[PDB]
Amino acid sequence: LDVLNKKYSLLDHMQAMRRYLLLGQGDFIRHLMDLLKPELVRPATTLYQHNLTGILETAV
Amino acid sequence: LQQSLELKRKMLRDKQNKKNSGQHLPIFPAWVYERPALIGDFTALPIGTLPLASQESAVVEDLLYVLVGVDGRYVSAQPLAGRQSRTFLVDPNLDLSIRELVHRILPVAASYSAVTRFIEEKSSFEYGQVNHALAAAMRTLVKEHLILVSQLEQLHRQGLLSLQKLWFYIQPAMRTMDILASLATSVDKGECLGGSTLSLLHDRSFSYTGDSQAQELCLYLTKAASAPYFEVLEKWIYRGIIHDPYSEFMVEEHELRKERIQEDYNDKYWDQRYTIVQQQIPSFLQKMADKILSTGKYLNVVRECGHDVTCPVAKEIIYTLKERAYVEQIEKAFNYASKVLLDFLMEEKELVAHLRSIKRYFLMDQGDFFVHFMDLAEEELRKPVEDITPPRLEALLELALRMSTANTDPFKDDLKIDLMPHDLITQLELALSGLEAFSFDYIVKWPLSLIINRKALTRYQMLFRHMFYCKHVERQLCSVWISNKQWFAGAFTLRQRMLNFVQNIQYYMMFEVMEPTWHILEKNLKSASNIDDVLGHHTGFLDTCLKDCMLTNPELLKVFSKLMSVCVMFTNCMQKFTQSMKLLVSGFEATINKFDKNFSAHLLDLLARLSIYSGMASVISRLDFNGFYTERLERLSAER
């Protein structure tokens, strides 16, 4: 137990997945869908992945 | 017998070859092997007519000699005497009831003499220090066999022995002899010496853990056998000096001053000067195998630069079953060597200012040195080969260094000037000199050779030479600009475009690779702990700067080479037009159109070959920040 709650972070890293991956904080999702509105409503199957990661890097 | 005498001299030849101060290694005299009176195993009437209870006394007496070597009277030590084995022959005219019990008592004699021969043979100089100590711990147990049979004889002389008592006496000590003889046949069969028969002992000690009769036997023999080995370990761990009188050690010294001197391009200490044998490890020290070599080799490469070092503390400690305090000592001594060498290297003959003065010239901290150099150089550089003379460049080096402010770092004093005579082809001509190939040279000393070798310096030069063409073509275009304080309007946008492109390429490599990765190296070198960490930081630094720059491409960017070709054509011809007109609108314009076509084609092709690379998409982003020439063609595709 002690090495995973001190020298690694297990609980603190588990909270973030609740907040974003499970969409458990809607502020992040609201601003993410808000700023990325045209790129989402358009087909992103004709758009490359690298642009979306690059704009996520500043969107987060 | 006869075959033993060969093996000895072959091993002696190997040990004479290993050392160059150990010469004429001794052997014991020939009569030692001629005489069979050294080993412990150097009238009669028909037994059939004797009564039973006299036969019993006679066979007890004859058997008692045979237990401890020396032959009996109705039992003979056999002359066929196969390899490392003994057989004995009881007579079949002996009464069968007695004789069958004699058969049961006989194994300890064959498990005596084979042991005793091994004690003489593997104690001489040609089988090494460990085999002597192994045999010296077996001779103690031979002595007690003699001890027991003498007291049994004293009881027998007083009419107080029978075969039953004697058999009952000898049953515990037969087991000892069995274990000892199995070990001796195992040592001889594999031709084991040095650490190959401490691996065997390490295994055999673990093997017996349901006995404690045979486990203590082997463990006492391991404690005895590791005592010569730990001396050799003391020499190599605590000193950069070994005496190694009989070589059976995992590290060997084979000299490698016969190829390099004053500087090692080989990095010979990590390669082949002091190298390890993986067969002579005792099969528990394999975990520590590298650390052993590094501990003393570090003391050498600091005693090579004339700086005294010492061991932290010295232990002599023997083997213990399953349990290791010397492992901790390997770690402590390895750490002491690495820490003292690391502290010495960063203060005395410091590599920090060395690396700063490498960044200043090849990865180029100052441009000031170079902007003086290029203007005072260019007319000489523009001329072909054989028109150069090294004193002009040397005067230019010293004047540009002292006139600029790069004359306050210490290490600039071995800096030289040279060229790269196979210029861009080398990456995986000498026809011009200064139009192709400009570079510098710096020679290194021993504390700064084992980190920065020849190869790293050559790679630094191949980065600098690539940047030199951009640096040169840039001021060509600038001179053409200032030469216009008629003209064609497309010529101005072409001049502006070429200039913006080359300037952006220089800026991108500069503030993506040279400043940021230097910031990384500055934090790596404050967190090294040994000379494999400073090696790791430097080689990861050089590999990162080589890969991160535009140097490495699968085809080396032929777009870029043809681009720089048409740039030097543009700067020559436009300036030539202006010098001739000072002394029409279709002679100038046609060449401007051809140049604009070639430059636009190569620019589009490099942007296309940059988009397939795909953060790392920022180069497309910065280069066409404004959204023009960011994509001028959708990129044509096949109809298949």
From Swiss-Prot, chain A:
Q: Which cystines does this chain contain?
A: none
* Location within or outside the cell: Cytoplasm, Cytoskeleton, Microtubule organizing center, Centrosome
**Tissues expressed in:** Ubiquitously expressed.
Job description of the protein: Component of the gamma-tubulin ring complex (gTuRC) which mediates microtubule nucleation. The gTuRC regulates the minus-end nucleation of alpha-beta tubulin heterodimers that grow into microtubule protafilaments, a critical step in centrosome duplication and spindle formation.
Q: Subunit info?
A: Component of the gamma-tubulin ring complex (gTuRC) consisting of TUBGCP2, TUBGCP3, TUBGCP4, TUBGCP5 and TUBGCP6 and gamma-tubulin TUBG1 or TUBG2. TUBGCP2, TUBGCP3, TUBGCP4, TUBGCP5 and TUBGCP6 assemble in a 5:5:2:1:1 stoichiometry; each is associated with a gamma-tubulin, thereby arranging 14 gamma-tubulins in a helical manner. Gamma-tubulin at the first position is blocked by TUBGCP3 at the last position, allowing 13 protafilaments to grow into a microtubule.
- Family per record: Belongs to the TUBGCP family.
Protein name according to UniProt: Gamma-tubulin complex component 3
Organism encoding this protein: Homo sapiens (Human)
Q: What is the lineage of its organism?
A: Eukaryota, Metazoa, Chordata, Craniata, Vertebrata
Write the gene name.
Answer: TUBGCP3
- What range of the parent protein does this fragment cover? 546 to 605 of 907
Curated annotation (Swiss-Prot), chain B:
Q: In which tissues is it expressed?
A: Ubiquitously expressed.
Name a biological process GO annotation: microtubule nucleation
Effect on the protein upon substituting R175C? In CDCBM15; uncertain significance
Keywords, ordered alphabetically: Cytoplasm, Cytoskeleton, Disease variant, Epilepsy, Intellectual disability, Lissencephaly, Microtubule, Phosphoprotein
Question: Which disease is noted in the annotation?
Answer: Cortical dysplasia, complex, with other brain malformations 15: An autosomal recessive disorder characterized by global developmental delay, variably impaired intellectual development, speech delay, facial dysmorphism, microcephaly, and varying degrees of cortical malformations including pachygyria, thin corpus callosum and subcortical band heterotopia. Most patients have generalized seizures.
* Family under the similarity heading: Belongs to the TUBGCP family.
Q: How does it assemble?
A: Component of the gamma-tubulin ring complex (gTuRC) consisting of TUBGCP2, TUBGCP3, TUBGCP4, TUBGCP5 and TUBGCP6 and gamma-tubulin TUBG1 or TUBG2. TUBGCP2, TUBGCP3, TUBGCP4, TUBGCP5 and TUBGCP6 assemble in a 5:5:2:1:1 stoichiometry; each is associated with a gamma-tubulin, thereby arranging 14 gamma-tubulins in a helical manner. Gamma-tubulin at the first position is blocked by TUBGCP3 at the last position, allowing 13 protafilaments to grow into a microtubule.
- Described purpose of this protein according to its UniProt entry: Component of the gamma-tubulin ring complex (gTuRC) which mediates microtubule nucleation. The gTuRC regulates the minus-end nucleation of alpha-beta tubulin heterodimers that grow into microtubule protafilaments, a critical step in centrosome duplication and spindle formation. Plays a role in neuronal migration.
- The name this protein carries in UniProt is Gamma-tubulin complex component 2
Starting at the broadest rank, the lineage of the source organism is:
Eukaryota, Metazoa, Chordata, Craniata, Vertebrata
